[PDB]
Every structure is written in structure tokens, then in C-alpha cells.
Specification:
part of a larger assembly, 6 chains, A mainly alpha (213), B mainly alpha (73), C mainly alpha (742), D mainly alpha (41), E mainly alpha (159), F mainly alpha (79), A: 213 residues, mainly alpha, C: two-stranded antiparallel sheet, 6 strands, binds chlorophyll A, binds beta-carotene, binds iron/sulfur cluster, transmembrane (chain C), 4Fe-4S (chain C), transmembrane helix (chain C)
Chain lengths: 213, 73, 742, 41, 159, 79
Amino acid sequence: FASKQSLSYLDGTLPGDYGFDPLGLMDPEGAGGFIDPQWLPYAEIINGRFAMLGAAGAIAPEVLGRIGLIPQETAIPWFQSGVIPPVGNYSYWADPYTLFVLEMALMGFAEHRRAQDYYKPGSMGKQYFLGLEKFLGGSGNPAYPGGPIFNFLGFGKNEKELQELKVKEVKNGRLAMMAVLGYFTQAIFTGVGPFQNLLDHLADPVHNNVLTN
Amino acid sequence: MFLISWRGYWQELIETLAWAHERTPLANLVRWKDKPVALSIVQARLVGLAHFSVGYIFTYAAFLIASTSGKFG
Amino acid sequence: EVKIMVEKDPVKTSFEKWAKPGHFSRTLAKGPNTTTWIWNLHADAHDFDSHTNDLEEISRKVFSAHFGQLAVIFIWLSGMYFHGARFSNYEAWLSDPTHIKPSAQVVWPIVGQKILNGDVGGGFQGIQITSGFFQLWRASGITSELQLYTTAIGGLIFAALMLFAGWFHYHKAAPKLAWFQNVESMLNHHLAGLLGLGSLAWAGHQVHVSLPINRLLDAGVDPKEIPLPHEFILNRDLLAQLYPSFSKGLTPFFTLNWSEYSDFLTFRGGLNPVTGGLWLTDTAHHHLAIAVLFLVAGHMYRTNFGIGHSMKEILEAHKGPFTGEGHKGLYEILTTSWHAQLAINLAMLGSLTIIVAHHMYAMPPYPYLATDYATQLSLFTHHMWIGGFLVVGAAAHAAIFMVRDYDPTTQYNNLLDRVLRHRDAIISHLNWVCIFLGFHSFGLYIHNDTMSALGRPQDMFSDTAIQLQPVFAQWIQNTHALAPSLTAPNATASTSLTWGGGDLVAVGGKVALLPIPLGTADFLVHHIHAFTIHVTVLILLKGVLFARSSRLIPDKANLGFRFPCDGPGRGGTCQVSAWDHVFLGLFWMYNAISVVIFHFSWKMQSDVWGSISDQGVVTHITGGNFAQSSITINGWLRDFLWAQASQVIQSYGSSLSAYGLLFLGAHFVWAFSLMFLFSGRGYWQELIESIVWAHNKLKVAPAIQPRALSIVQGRAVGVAHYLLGGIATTWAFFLARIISVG
Amino acid sequence: MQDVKTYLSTAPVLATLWFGFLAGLLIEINRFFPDALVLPL
Amino acid sequence: KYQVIEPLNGDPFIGGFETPVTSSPLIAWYLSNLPAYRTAVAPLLRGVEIGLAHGYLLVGPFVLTGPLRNSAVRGEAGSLAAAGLVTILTMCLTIYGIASFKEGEPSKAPSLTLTGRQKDADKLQTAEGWASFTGGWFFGGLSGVAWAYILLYVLNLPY
Amino acid sequence: YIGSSTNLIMVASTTLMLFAGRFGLAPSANRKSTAGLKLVDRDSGLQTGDPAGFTATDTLACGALGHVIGVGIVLGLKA
Ligand code: CLA
Ligand code: CLA
Ligand SMILES: CC1=C(/C=C/C(C)=C/C=C/C(C)=C/C=C/C=C(C)/C=C/C=C(C)/C=C/C2=C(C)CCCC2(C)C)C(C)(C)CCC1
Ligand code: SF4
């Protein structure tokens, strides 16, 4: 509840309203462009979602290959697999560039619909989507689409537990953002995956912490 | 000099030169009779044309005499 | 306090204001009755503070115009890089930089101009460039045309980006006046962010890629066998082969034991003995120091985080006895007027350009730069002209501010008021010192000319007759020559070779630099420089001070900044505004800079450059005839103009033909300027009537009545043509001389 | 689209389009019929 | 010492200032005690003093740097040139006195002091006053040139 | 290395310089200076946790200044 004063906009409403803004990037006085108070929470939400989805996959191969489950194709470093050619790359069933354009073609559909639901809330439920026209209407906030598909189990029924789930999600997203930043950084001063860094820190911290390079 | 720059600059210069002459000791015992003013407009054009013409005549008379008489054809 | 301020979508982007040509100003938005509408349209097309009156729209327009200018500069840079990539003999130049003339432009064969593609070497045919881009790319570590192509594309991207921003911040998200006024945070971010982080990033690039590649280029290896600039990033061992200090990792920097970085972070004067340029191991250290300097200097001014200075308590605190109420009321001047900022910025940027032009020739920072004489002369002349233009612009904008932004109801703060209240003294003393300098500088030349004409050279002011040795410059030279032993114990050598100390350095024949002597011929020309600079300051300062009122016209500020004259009365009041003082000062700036560049050209060709042979014998280009022949105007006529002008005139039928053509073209333009500079509007307006008569006689009378150019546009056209002709003549002469004989 | 045509109907734009087309024409003629001093007709 | 700049005589509507250069005790004393500003003394004596000073100082730039500065007539040519300059200046002073002064006008000189005391104007701004000034200046200049030459190129004590 | 003199100055300088954001000493966020070095403003806006004096910004400034001084002293003990 500290490290800043709740000036005029961080009253306590949003999930994770710890009243932290020493610069004033949500201040509603000058809000046009991309830093209005309606785009910043959404951006934090989905950046945290992607960080939560990436900070697990960055370690998953390296930690699974230690259990001997996966064959020896799991690159112990998260970066020796395609994503950066010059430091090592793995050969998949296609060129990394045709994989890239296929990924962009599959993601354009996934992202333009979401953008149109943000800019036009009720839309994306009117135009006949090819094949099974699915009910993907903008059921409320553009960051919580609800729906019978984006909520398989309906976890969260009324306001209390739903708000608790939301604040848990934003906190885990911030943690995962910091985790992937740590991945990126300590992949440079060490030269090896993060799980190996944790193991070598568990070995002996007196001679293996950050103050050794 | 007399054809490009015009009077309103030189008069505003003389007006402070006269001040500087008046407000100095040991040199305000002397005194001008005719008030110093900048040359007139047509007078400036005339002086400029006279300079242009004298220079034009002289720098070519000198050249035509030196380049020829120095070789005599 | 300090925050982001934006007004969402203040102007709808459309084409409506685009179809109506005159739209910004309502006085000429109606339509072109006469033909003096087409002219003033372009005249006040950029007069943002004249169309409207609120500082907010003016500031937004200024911002977007800056973005457009940046986009144009990015297009220019990407074009230069693409030309260096596609139509340049760069790779061939890299294999032999001492026998291959740079060239990055080719000409289509259409009408016989094919001969402009001269034989520059390396199997190439094209115009020989003098921009110095090849040396810059060699110093950057660029070693392949590919590495150019990419960056070209890069530039293009930024161009588009800039354009986008330029649109965005005017049409979608434009700030409001209260945002631009935060000068404290603006200076904080330009010091710490733009200059500090920029210098740090360039020091990083240097220390990582530019040092090993250039060192391997100095060791004589093929530019194709040199590893790529990333093999030194992902292999600290391949880089430590040259500078083994890298083997110690990033530990010395963090334990303050970084005195072991003396391999690549050096402090050594002089030039590299094989490239004739500075040590890149020295420029890396320089940039590393400058970066932290600007970074710690970017924390001075107060933001919304409690600490820091405020540039209003700093100003008011300086208020002495002699100077009234001190610097009070100047923070209100430089945050509510765009002109009082443009004046200071233009003055400082022009002076800085002059400093750059003086430093670069004396301490060549790029490899094989001091060897190529054409590049080293063009980089001096161009920058000198740029600075000379910028200072006059500063004067003009200070005059504009004084004319239509100054007001006394708040300027009772006796600093600007006090200097305004003794202008009749300031200008009088400046006039006296200008006269004194003019006499005691030019009369000496006239004395020398008359004596050498009267067969009595013993009465001249030469170095054999009565001497005028500049003792202070000689003492400064001798002091800097001994600095690395007493006043700079860690620097291995003096900062430059132009100081009397040191010795000569060769780059394979032609000489790079050597100690420069200073005799009477230098005393005279330095005093002439001082005199011309003083006269220019006289004109510009007189205009600026008398921009508001004078004894002749007490209400000149009502007339405005730009107006021809207040009648033929009071004897005559032609050319009485500040615009006319800028018009008059442009010519003296031209005179001064032309004298400076002539000085530099002759002195360098006479006492610096040349081609040394074995056993040490060095013969300069002209033969050291500057100390003796530059003391008389006749010497500047024959030994400099007549002698050195013998290359351009007879360049017909050669690869240097365009210079010979542009010589006469610029002469024609200069002489054409005199028609506008000497004549007046009335004669031409009358003559036009007798042509309109012939037109009416045949029913071809235009509806836009042909009026003649205004009294101010005539002067503008005259000075523009004059400057173009003069500078282009000197351009052609200098290039056609130095390309052939250098 | 109408205002775009009006803008393209301005004096500088029509001038530069006309002069560029004429320059292209003359340049092509001189690249195909070079060194013409006397009319061979 | 608070604020050293002041308008002339405390009147803001005159063209100048009382800066430390113009108005100051030492400067006002040094400037009042000069012969051209001593009012009551007869013009002839002031002219004699001024001519003496000027003719004595003028021998320098004529002898050291002349056309005959490298001959046995080194000092004599410079002294003659100085005498020529002082007689030319005497002629200019004479024609100025004729053109600027009448033989009936009382005085063009100021009459008041710095505090408005009704003093008497300087007799130098009369026609006969300027004539006496010119004669005394002629004599003083000739005598000063002669004395300078005597001290330099007849006796000891080089410089 | 923690026991060496090279590290003994960077800690001392940073602590002594940090003894101004809490106790009335060298200027910080909540205390401004004056042309006479009066050190009497006692006005700001910033949320801290303790009674008064030390905030979240002035700590960084005190640390940076102490680090500049400590680096200067460590590199000045080379002559
Ligand atoms: C930072 C640089 C800078 C900036 C932003 C400005 C900005 C401005 N200046 Mg300014 N100025 C500058 C530098 C700058 N100037 C310099 C360096 C000088 C000294 C020469 C001047 C001298 C100057 C004067 C004398 C005047 C201005 C005026 C103005 C204002 C209107 C300008 C306008 O509409 O021009 C529109 C632009 C044109 C009409 C273009 C004219 C074409 C030029 C002269 C020829 C270019 C030749 C080219 C290089 C090559 C020729 C060959 C090729 C064409 C074939 C505007 C605020 C005017 C004003 O009233 O201010 C309020 C005004 O009267 N300026
Ligand atoms: C070659 C041409 C030329 C010359 C000689 C001058 C000379 C001068 N200009 Mg100038 N000017 C010119 C062209 C020229 N201008 C042009 C083309 C322009 C248009 C842009 C201007 C615009 C301009 C401006 C805007 C200003 C000047 C100023 C000045 C004066 C500067 C003071 C000085 O140095 O005195 C030195 C004088 C000389 C070196 C002249 C030669 C004197 C000789 C050596 C002495 C002869 C000995 C003896 C007297 C001869 C007696 C003869 C008798 C026996 C018959 C000076 C009189 C400035 C001014 O008024 O400042 C006072 C000023 O503000 N001019
Ligand atoms: C009371 C308290 C406490 C204690 C305290 C402490 C412990 C603190 C810490 C803090 C600190 C201890 C701080 C520090 C800081 C630091 C800083 C902030 C740094 C900075 C840096 C910089 C700035 C750098 C830069 C540089 C470089 C890089 C090089 C060159 C030079 C220089 C140096 C400039 C605790 C928390 C426990 C708890 C609560 C209460
Ligand atoms: S310029 Fe126009 S105004 Fe000034 S004098 Fe000549 S005519 Fe009269």
C-alpha cells in the first residue's frame, strides 16, 4: 500500500491497486495515444499472461531432460533452439523463416480479432466467422472475454472469488515478467540455461553467486 | 559600397557617432558647424556610379597598356 | 508538476486545407489578385508565429516540422549509404587506400557527359567524391558493401518512422503548451539521455568492433580475411588476441581496479604513424569519459522528485551592483518565446561548427584523412560556411524577438534594459574599434604594396624588414609542445602535431602534419580576421539594438521587423529595419569566411602539405612562398589567384570538366546578382507596363496582374544570387585545384 | 478524392510533371538520335 | 559603493551616465587639472603648455620609423618632420579659429559648474582667445621639438 | 576481498553520505538549500514508511553521490 501516494486514480479499484506510480504514466490529465488509463491495465494483463506462458517454457525442456524423460533434443539453454541462430539452433521440420511466416499468419487472426474487440467491444460476434461461427462476443471487459470457450470450467462465479483470481493472476504475471527479464540477463553473464544457474547456485553460493564474473 | 548599402543605416550610425563626439572630454572644445548627415539617395547613386566608372576605366587602361607595351604586339 | 500533457486529435487530417493553396494566413487566403501573392505565400509559408497568436499551436507546428526535417535528414543519410554500397569503389579502396581515389557516384552516358566518369582506380569510373565517407566507414569498421546495404534500409525505416511521428504528434496526440515549457526535464533528458547515453553507446561500439577490425587493418591483413564484427562479441578470446586485457573479463571495471584497461583505454597524443589519424584506443577512452561526464551532468535541474536546481532561483541570485536587477525576468523570456531560444541555439551551434572545423584539420580523427588533401580542405570550407551562416541567423532571430516579442511592462529587470539604454555607447565604441582595426590591418598591406612597388623593399613589413612576429601564439605553441613532460605527465605526447614540438609523420609519400611556423604574414592575416569579424558584429549588433527605435524613427517597432523604408523623408530612410541589417551583414560574413578559407588553403599548401622523398627531403606543393609573398595584395593576386586558378581554367576535355563549367556558371550568377542589388522597383514596375500594353494589344493579358518584386524581395534575391555565385566559384576553384594537385 | 485532383491541378505540380515528361522525351530522343547538328531531311 | 552608475547630474533626461569612467573623484581631479580645462588661466599659457607637450612627444614616431631612419641624419629628419607637422597643425587651428569664431560674440563656452553655480565662461571660445591659443601652441610645439632633439641627438642618456 | 582497503572506502563513503537523508544534514528530497546554504525548506510530497526524512528517491541520490566520492577517493590513492 506504499512507495507512492494514491494521487487521483489509484484509489483501490483495479486488481492489484498497490498505489505504485512514481512517474505518473496513468495520470488522466494527459492521456491520449497509448498511455490512457484504459490501455495500460490491459497491456499489463496480457504482457503478464505472455510472460507467465514464456517463463515456464524457457525452463521446461532443461528441467525435463534432467529427469531423463525427453530425448537429448531439449536444448539445456533455452536459447540454443532456433530463436537465436548464431549461438546455436535446432533443425525442425521447416526453415525458421517459413516457421516464422506461418506463426505470423496464424497469429494475425488471433490478434486482429482481439484488437477489434478492444476497439469495438460488441463486435466479433456479428460477422460470420468461417466454419463454425463461434460465440466469441465481447462479454464485458476486453481483458476478460468470459464466454463458454475462453472459460472452459467457469472458474470464478461471483465477484469475490473472481477478484481474488484476478489479483492472483496479475501478481503472478508481474513475477513471471521479472523472471523472464532475469532469464534474458543472466543468459549473457553466464552462458547457460537458468536451471543450470540455479543448480550451480545450490552447489555453493560463496563461490558461485553473481559476484564471480 | 555606395550601391548596395542605403542611407537609413548610415544616418542611424552618424547619429551615434555625433553622440560619441559630444560626450567625450578634451574633444568637445572643437565643434562642427555643418551638422554631419549621411549622403543623400541620388547623391549616393552618383558617388557609387563615379567610383564604378573610375575603377572600370583605370583597371582596363592599366591592363591594355601593360599587356601590350610589355610585349609590343 | 511535471507530467505528460496531450490533447487527443486536435486537427483532423484531410485534403481540404490542401486544395486551397493559401490557407494559413487569412490575408492571402482569399486569392491572387496580383502576382505578389505567389511570392509572399512562399515568403511567410513558415512564419508560424505570424499566422496565429497562441503559443500552443505554434509549438505543435514547430515540433512536427522538426520531425519532418529529421525524416529528410534520414533519407539523405540512407541515400549516401546506399550510394556507397551500390556505385562505389569502396572494397577496392580498402585494399589500397593510398593509390585509389574515393568515388561513390557514376553518371549515365547520354550526351557526352560520360567523360565525367574519370579513372579513379580499382577498375572503377566515376566522379571522385570528397565527403570523407570512405574514411568514416573505414574508421567505423565497415568492411563490406553488404554492411552498407543493410544500414541504408535501416535509415529508410527511421525516415518513415520520423514521418509517422511527425503526423502523429500533430493529428492524433498533440501536446499542449504546458508540456513544452518544462525546460528543466528537457535539459535533464538531453544531457543524460541524448548526449550521455549516445556517447556511451558509441564508446561501446568502438571498444567492441571498431578497435579490433581497425587494428587488424593496420597489421596489413586482407579486409576479406578479417572476422566479422560479431566474432569479437561471441568470442572474448578472439578479441583478447589483440588486447589481452579483455581476458580479465568485466571484473576490473567493477572493483575500481580498471587501471589494467590501459591496452584499449589509452592516453597517447600524436597520430597513428601508418594511417595519419588519431588512435582509436584513445577516442574510445575519450567517449567513455564524455559519456559519464554528460550523465552525471544530467542530474542538475529539479523535477517532481524533490531534489535538483531550478533555473529561476539560479538566475535571480546573480544580481550585482553594476548591473541593476541581475538576470531577473530571463526565465520568462526563454519559455514564452521561441525566437529568443533560436537565437542562442543558432549562435552556439555556429560557433561550435567553427570549433569543429578548426579541430578536425589539426587532429585528423579518421584514418588516411590527412593524406587526402581534397577531403581535408572540403571538410574545413563546408563547415566554416555553415557556421558563418548560423551565426548570422542567430543575429536575425534575436532581432525578430526584440522587434515583436519584447515588452517593457515586465522587462523592468535591468539587464536587457540596461544594455538597451547605452546602445549609443556600445555601437560608438564598436565603430571606433572597427575603424582602428581596419586601418592597422589593411593599411599595412597597402604600405607593403607601395614599398614593393617603389623599389624599396627594405621599408616593408616583411620577415626580413621590420618584423611583426606574433609572440603570444609562439609562446602558446611552445607551451603546448612541452605539456607531455611537465603539465601532462601521463599523456605520452602533445595533443597535436601543429604545435612547434614533435616531428613529421608520413603516410607513404605525402605528408600528414608537422609543426606550423608563425611569422609576420600570419600576424597580418589574423588581425584582418579580427577586423572582419568585428565589422560583422558591428552590423548585426547595431541592427539588433536599434530594432525597436532610434533617433531617426522613434516608432520603428510599430512598422515591424521587415519593411523597406519610412519614406524618402528625413533626408532618406532606406534600409532602416533589422532585416536590412541582416541583409548587410550577410555580405561581411561572406567576406570574412572567404578570407579565412583563402588563408587556410594557401598556408596549408605552402607550409604543411607536400610529398617527402627518401633521406627526409620534403617539398611542399607551392614551395613555402606564403611567408614572403602573402604580405602584399599583388601576391594574393598572382601567387594565389592567378597561379592556383591555372588548373580549373584548362580542365576542359578532362574528368574535371564540370568544375571548369561551374566556375563560369557561378561567375554568371554572381554578376547576375548585381542587377537586383543595384536597381530599384520603380523602373521595373514602369517597364512592365509597356509589356502589358503589347499583351493587351493581342488579348493575352493575364488575370494575375504582373507587379514587380517588392523592395525587400529584390534585396533578398540579390543577396541570395551573390552568395550562391561567390561560394560556388570558390567551391569549383578549390576542388579543381586540390583534386588535381593533391 | 476530388481535393486530391484539385491539388494535382496546382501550378507547381503540373509544371514539374510537364517538365519531367519533356525532359524524358528529349533525353530518349538524344539517346536514340545523338549528335544531331544538321537536319537530314 | 551600492550602485555606482548614475544619470548626468542626477537628471535622467540627458544623453549619458555618471559612470566611474566619466564621473569620479580621481578622474574629475585629473581632468580638471588639465591645461585645456583650467578656465581662468590666460589662453596663451595653456596653448604654450599644450604645444610643448605635443611637440615633445611627436619626435618619437618620426625619428625611429622614417624614410631616413638608417642614416647619419637620423634624428634631424625626424625633428624637421615634427616641426612640419606642428606648423601644419597651427595652420589648421588658425583656419578653424577664423571659420568658427566671430569678433563680437561674448562666449560659446559653458558658464555653470556641476551644481549650477553662475561662474564665467571660458575665454578660449573667443576669437582673440583662440588666436592667442594658436600662437602659444605654435611656440610651444616648436620649442618642444627643439628640446626633444637637443636631449636625444646632442647629449647622453640613451633609451 | 570484503576485507580489503579498496572496498573499505566505497562502503565508508556510501554510509557517511547516507547519513544525510535521515538526519538534518546534506540536502535531500524533503530539505532544500538556499543561496546562503540555510538548509531550511521542509516541504515536499512523497510517501515513505518511517516517521520522516528518508524517502525512496533521496536514497538513490545519496548513494550515487557517495559512489562518485568513493570512486574519486579510491582512484585518488594512486599517487
Ligand atoms: C535553425 C535554423 C533556422 C530556422 C528554424 C529559421 C526559421 C525562420 N526564419 Mg530564418 N534564418 C536562418 C536560420 C533559420 N531560420 C539563418 C541561418 C539565417 C541567415 C541567412 C536566417 C535569416 C532569416 C531572415 C532574414 C528571415 C528569416 C525568417 C524566418 C521565419 C520564416 C522563414 C520562412 O518562411 O522561410 C521560407 C523559406 C524560403 C522562402 C526559402 C527561400 C530559398 C532560399 C533563400 C534559397 C536556398 C538556396 C539553396 C541552398 C540552393 C539554391 C539553388 C537551388 C534552389 C536551385 C522562420 C521562423 C523570416 C522572418 O520574418 O522570420 C519571422 C525572415 O525575414 N530567417
Ligand atoms: C573594397 C571596398 C570597400 C571598402 C574599402 C570599404 C570600407 C569600409 N567599409 Mg564597407 N562595404 C562595401 C565595400 C567596401 N567597404 C560593400 C560592397 C558593402 C556592401 C555589403 C559594404 C558595407 C559596409 C557596412 C555595412 C559597413 C561598412 C564599413 C566600412 C568601414 C570599416 C572601417 C574601416 O575598416 O576603415 C578602414 C578603411 C580603409 C581600409 C579604407 C582605405 C584607407 C586607406 C588605406 C588610407 C588612405 C590614406 C589616405 C587617407 C589617403 C589620402 C588621399 C588624399 C591624399 C587624396 C570602411 C570605411 C563599416 C563602417 O562604417 O564602420 C566604420 C560598416 O558598418 N561597409
Ligand atoms: C535503515 C534501513 C535499512 C538499511 C539501509 C540500507 C542497507 C540501505 C542500502 C542502500 C544502499 C547501500 C544504497 C546504495 C546505493 C548505490 C547507488 C545508488 C549506486 C549508484 C551507482 C552509480 C551512480 C554509478 C555510476 C558510476 C559509474 C558506473 C562509473 C563511473 C562513476 C560512477 C560512480 C558515477 C534496511 C534497508 C536494511 C531496512 C530498512 C531500514
Ligand atoms: S527605398 Fe523606397 S523608401 Fe527608401 S528611399 Fe528609396 S524609395 Fe523612398
